[model samples]
Target chain A: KWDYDLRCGEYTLNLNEKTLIMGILNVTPDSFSDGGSYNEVDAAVRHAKEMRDEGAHIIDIGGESTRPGFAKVSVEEEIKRVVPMIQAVSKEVKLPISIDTYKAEVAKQAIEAGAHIINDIWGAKAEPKIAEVAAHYDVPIILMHNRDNMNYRNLMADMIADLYDSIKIAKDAGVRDENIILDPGIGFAKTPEQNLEAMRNLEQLNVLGYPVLLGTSRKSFIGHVLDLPVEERLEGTGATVCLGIEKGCEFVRVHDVKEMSRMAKMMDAMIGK
Target chain B: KWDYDLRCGEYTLNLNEKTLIMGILNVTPDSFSDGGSYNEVDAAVRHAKEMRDEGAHIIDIGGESTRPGFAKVSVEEEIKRVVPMIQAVSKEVKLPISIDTYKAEVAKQAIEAGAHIINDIWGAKAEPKIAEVAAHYDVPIILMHNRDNMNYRNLMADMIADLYDSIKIAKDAGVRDENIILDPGIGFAKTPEQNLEAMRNLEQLNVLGYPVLLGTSRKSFIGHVLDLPVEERLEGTGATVCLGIEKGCEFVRVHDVKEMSRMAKMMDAMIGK
Candidate 1:
């Protein structure tokens, strides 16, 4: 057992001695960062095994592209893109497979194919049944803070309130406290200004009493602020990873697994694990 | 004349009206991040001109390598390595030239060659005569905190207290208050753990009432923590740059001038620029 404190609903994962780094394995043709690198089942499985070897605890597989202005895929297509990848990865590696999807049908199919975690970018509001799928599968669900609107009286307060509503919805869908995690959603629907603020003050979300997973890896805000192309977003991601750990984030979801793992290790050593 | 507030010494370099980036132009064969790429005078001058076009306000020229396990260079060799580059860059570019050296002779010659700033990583303690030279030349001097011994009873307190001692040395040597700058010296003679702690709590150094500068650009601590090589440290560096700005750092010394400048601008906009 690790010597750390992580609360997902009521299932607390002890990781004080070891911090977790989640590697992103996008199985889509147009991911903003990876750009169709692992769209095939064989490539996705290969990448998952590589991340595991590089010390990733969880492999997050995303199907549909979520870049700004990209056309959204149907739920059926999303499941088809993800389920095979998850099944192949689970068979290839022993680590937990996290399906990064917000659609209920996609989550259900991913879980049925052996994914152990559901990483919902929409915080369960896009489709309420996504929470039901997690509760039925008895797997941990990461409920992230996001919205369709950028206008707000106060950004942080509204974000917190949004997560509160997500918690209520997850509970209503029979999802127990032990199976839910919280993510601040650094770049989702936030302006560049709001995204930077969200990264600066992630500790506010940790106060929600759940394991906080930060997914700032190669997000568009980094690209927008740094004025670099997609491949150069690693530095921006590293900064957020270090800051997240300092602010008590339990898990850091990143694309560059090895680099972020080292960054988190150093940050935890400087502060608390 | 940009709209963002960048406090250096008593002066706030507001950049919302314009843009300023500090390009890394090292004349040393072994600076921690560059891997000896700019050791030659011609190469260094060419790089400086390139950075000038990249929007760097100052061409920071360093002679000696401060990386861990760096071999010490003699004063004459140090002067020889940096003075020609300073002369060449000052002639080749219209931007201000900042000498990154700790030797008194090097500072004096570089200033005579038209350097506008003296960025001393040793904070004027390396050679008392260096502070006297800065006072004599009346150029802006950046006093950074560095020590030979790694032991400290209280990390943050000791850092501030040691900075106080350097301030006294500079003041006694006739360096003016407005002409002086304080750098936290992230990753200089410190452990990776200490560097991260110093970065997260950098605001503590603001007690000196001097403008605070942070030099976390592509340092080894980023690599040590992230387990990445020199070329892949931009994301980690970006994170620290954002953190430094959030903590009220007046200026960020960096190599990727354009990216760091953009990140700094976005951060300032979100956090009361």
Candidate 2:
């Protein structure tokens, strides 16, 4: 297990003490009414607070839509969209606020506005400057395993090596070892079969000596595996959460906070997470 | 992993194919209306078919109530109650029916009335004759770990030794190894601490080389762990279900068949059974 008392601004997490839950918070147009940014920010803050009350240890705030074919917005609009929300959530929720983005400018602005952690989906490969922003702010940075394509000679070894590339980039950017966390990037450029393959071998990432985070909440792989719709994947997500914990994941990113939190608590109690 | 094509009357279970689900069916006074045995058998048969529709591979029917401190019923009453229900269920539902009792007479009558498996709470120690009934019927038997008292010098060793005692009785009684299954008795004579201790070290039973059946469904220990009521222990039961699969349990006896069945399906998909 990764032995570290990880810090996120004022919050400190004993990763070994329990498997932590990072609830997903999306501040999208459809999520809030046509009520402009002012009222939308308030709604976003309320959602973040709700997640906290629902047993969320960290709130992952994102501006970009996670849909498959959704178009990406400009860096300025993304910054404008997330900064006030992060600032308000940081002041309201006592738990950590992690900014979910891959753009350097958006990451820096979110951090300067009081975000505590940086979750870059593209690893450090998309914008290596995001790693510098994380290092400069002295916050934990999650380097997710992703790929440009599924072409590979071997799945496990290639994925681990790809993660090390991100690790090297984060290290050269002056990020502290304790400030780095690995994610298997389940659902990114991977089919359902590859997603399961990555999840089955998730323990291989432990060789990097960092607390790993699993983000398989409502992913298509679970829906595919169970042949369930997006809404009916709670038990399917529970499967990945428990399996991830058994395979050495200290953090889990999920949408259903209360249900997954109970699963994690029971697993921690049973297995000494 | 246990490799056996276990025959249960008309149904056959490949212990290596997947984690099988055994739905608990209790034919008690409160479970049915006051219409007496004639109409009550109709309700019981409906329930068995309902469990089958909900993905239950096996149905475990019991005439006695499972409530703690409830007075035990007489052997004649138990046999009288379960025989009609089993005969009706076997004629209606295609799944195998297991009679839950430790009384040899009840076991014999139930089998003659069409029960396919014997689930003895006393681990065949209550009446070694029950094991003979199982051998004679050529059906499966679930040997659960139990004790007359909680006086244990060692938890794991004593529990495993106790199970071996049951195994010896079955082997000597001509029960085939293929027809034998083990249950750690999660809620039997165990404090919450001892129950969790038993669950944590369940893999030790693999040395016995028999397929294991886990019966932690809606048990008080789950309610105690989550500090939730028995009705709200679904996810906690799910925690035990996932962990049980990881630790080598091939069969699970549960009350919530649909939900726990989904969890088991995802676990099987993630890691091959």
Candidate 3:
């Protein structure tokens, strides 16, 4: 039975029952989608509340842009952007809030400021202490599959091995097995073709014996596949969420919370049975 | 390979390559969604052209309202409403047009006016000779499973048997097997639970050895699931279409052609490999 209950902070997600939708709430001015759109604390809180009403199980707040070839933000800047947003969102929305950062300091501060989950795009590979922060906070950490370079001897195998390395880091850092989630990062450190190939073989990631969180919402692979711009990839994102759910992904991180939530619900109803 | 080429009038849909999107264009004053919205010839033509431009593989033009407890229209009224719309759409759009009617007279008139396919909601059970009209024109006919009585021996089994009866009628009427498509009607003579159960077991409908078309766009079941009205069912509809494509459905009938078409394309890219 692939039934697992993910207990993160005050939220308990019954992974066996239905797919959870994690709405992406980027507080960064340079994030690819909705960049500078919700930088204000009030605006970010309102967006988080709106996403909760739209059926998002969790809200992922990112301070830095993870889009390809983007300039990196310093730890202080990242913390400055996210902490207030997390504090405001946590006050307004009752749903779990995820801090999207790889720096241990940012993750630690966000958790202290009311964030309940850690979403590191670097998969704890950039800074091993990030996993320790998650463990110290006793919150779930999403160990995403990522690499600094796109080179791979075997794409899927290498990605799986790299994710396992992150898993080892998380476990060694005292993060409970149940508190760790795997994310096969769709656009990060991946060629467009590699992304599609990863999506096609996403079921292989499930064999690692952990719940997978797929975050392909409005990503470049979708843009490459549909030849659509970032603003026009909602339906493409819907497709990936549906396919991901079919391949046993328990969580979907998305931008269009309402649409992708509905897609995930309908897919859960159709395929989870 | 489940790739079948459906030839309807001047259009050829290579179903094996990707799932085709069928855009619904209702010209009825009493249709549930967009009721009386496109009753005029110019409005209907514009909508058809818009759907075509939005990547709809086929345009389904319905003059009669098929919503639950909908008022009936006369054959004369149905023909009057659809034939001119079909004529105008055929002149303006290059895509294949489907005449949504169970009456032989309406189907014949619409086809004579340049419609390419017959979409019979009654599945030839209402008017048996409707299949003969499809055979006469040699156009592909979509046999949709519907019942005035909601009773069922076993939902899936009864629905499949009922569709088999429709197939027998079509075969007897000389409608080629290759020219027939089956639809597990989403909101026709089904309770809310039954509708969801049908969707959950939609892949079972493929056992009848025919291409399946799903028409769950903005239907009451979606409203029931998402608790939204007709106008708000786009995301819910997206979910159903994505699930349908995943379940081996060859075609999706929808109202929001552009979004659903993008969804279908993205789904094809992910699963078609």
Candidate 4:
């Protein structure tokens, strides 16, 4: 069996014994699957509590819509939208609140408002200050692999190098290596073929020497591949969840927490801790 | 991109660029997920037609339940159970049919009744004559890894060796190598943990140079892993299907045909042929 631990801020997640489940609480109005229904503070808080009740270890709250053609929100507006939700959910759910933002100012404010983790989809390229903020707060930062362009000389090689670069940024910013998690950014700036290749060879990503987080919940890759709408992507999402865990992913950020949680646990049993 | 062509009898399943969907049609009253719900000839025919319409390339029709502690049906009973269903569904669906049985008599009659493939759970060891039946019909047979006892000197090594032995039996019985397929049975006679081990390293089962068929659809292993009942096993099954495809499985046997077919296509698009 493998031996390792996943560090999420004050929480040292032991992966040697069990799998960790991170539930998605997308609070954006224009998010791909939920249609921004939980955009309000009350709705977001309710959903966060619901996910916690459903056995989610961490409630990942995202303010911006990162889907293709999504209009980018200003840092102030993103902070305004997510801080209250993060604070309210942190109080209501009794679980760690992870702010899903690549913007430094928003992450800084959310962490001050009691968020325990910073999930940066830009991997610190968008704003280097996010890593500083994560270091300042001493919270875990999820550095997701993404590029402004998908032009890759070698997809897997470029991905690994990009992630390594992000790790170096986190280190340069004083973020402890123990407090960093790596997300493969399943739907971010990658072609459908690249995403599948990434999913298939995820163990390659595990070579980064940190806990790998896979976030492929209801992405267009699933929609385009299955020819199904967003609502019909659960089965496809489930497949990726199991596949990710099989490839040594330590955490999965997904919308359907109950289903994916169960799937992760089952796959963990098969793959071992 | 990768390249491979899988020959299953007269059907040339080309995996160079397409996803293959193998749907489940259980004729046994106590099959883990579907049970004998499709035992009725009309229901079975309707179900097969529905799966085909939903994009299933092959319909796997099983005569006996292989779930642990399932009562073994006699040859006459197995024949009576599967023949009419295969006969009616083959006429209705217009797709290749696979009879899930290891008894020679049942396989012979099922082939006579129009089933094109034999899904032998015993890997042709339940009866030596079953190999002869497969040779006589000149049809493809899925030799699954299973044992009456769960004891193993080496889990994966013994499993592949068992499959090799089955291939030898088939060759001796005049079955061509091209007409052979391998299935690493997910929940047959193995513990829940062992089943998961099989699911993770499924590519090992294909080392004998035969196309592998993965049948983890809503199996008891998922239920055991997740503590979920059978009805709640869809997402878990979908995860297994995606992983199976990622690991080079040619076909996936699943209960929820539409959902899994969509997942297989999506996984293929991402992971490739």
* Candidate 1 lDDT tens digits, B1-273: 223343333224454433345688765454443232354666887788778776677788877644332448777666666677777788878777778888888889888877888888899998888899988877778899999988988889999999999999999999888777898888876888789889878989877887787888888888887777888877677777767776777777888886677666655544546
Writing each residue's lDDT as its tens digit, candidate 2 over A9-54 gives 7899888778999999887554443323767788888888888988
lDDT of 4 by residue, B103-179 (tens): 88888988888888888889989798999998987888889888889898878998888889999999999998878
Most accurate candidate by DockQ: 2
Model 2 Cα shift for residue B141 (angstroms) = 0.5
Ranked candidates (TM-score, high to low):
2, 3, 4, 1
Clashing pairs in 2: none
Per residue, candidate 3 scores C-alpha lDDT tens digits across B141-220 of: 99999988998989999999999999999999999989999999989899988998898889999888999999998898
| Native contacts kept (model 2) | 0.67
Q: Give the range of the ten consecutive residues with the poorest summed lDDT in model 3 chain B.
A: B28-37
Tens digit per residue, CA lDDT, model 2, B1-273: 555598876788888888999998877554443323776788898888888998999999887633333447778766667788899999889988888888889899989988899999899998999999988888899999998888889998998999999999999999999989999999899888888888788899988889899999988888878899978999999999998998889999999888999899989888865
- Model 4, A146-199: lDDT tens digits are 898999998889989999999999999999988888988888879887788888
Q: Judged by DockQ cut-offs, is candidate 1 incorrect, acceptable, medium or high?
A: acceptable
Winner by lDDT between candidate 2 and candidate 1:
2
The lowest-lDDT stretch of 10 consecutive residues in candidate 4 chain A is A30-39
Q: Tell me, what's the RMSD of every candidate?
A: 5.6, 2.1, 4.0, 4.4
Per-residue lDDT for B208 in model 1?
80
Candidate 1 versus the native: TM-score?
0.81
Provide the TM-score of chain B versus the true chain B for each model in turn: 0.87, 0.95, 0.93, 0.89
Number of clashes found in candidate 4? 3
Greater lDDT among 2 and 3 belongs to 2
Per-prediction interface RMSD?
3.9, 0.9, 1.6, 2.0
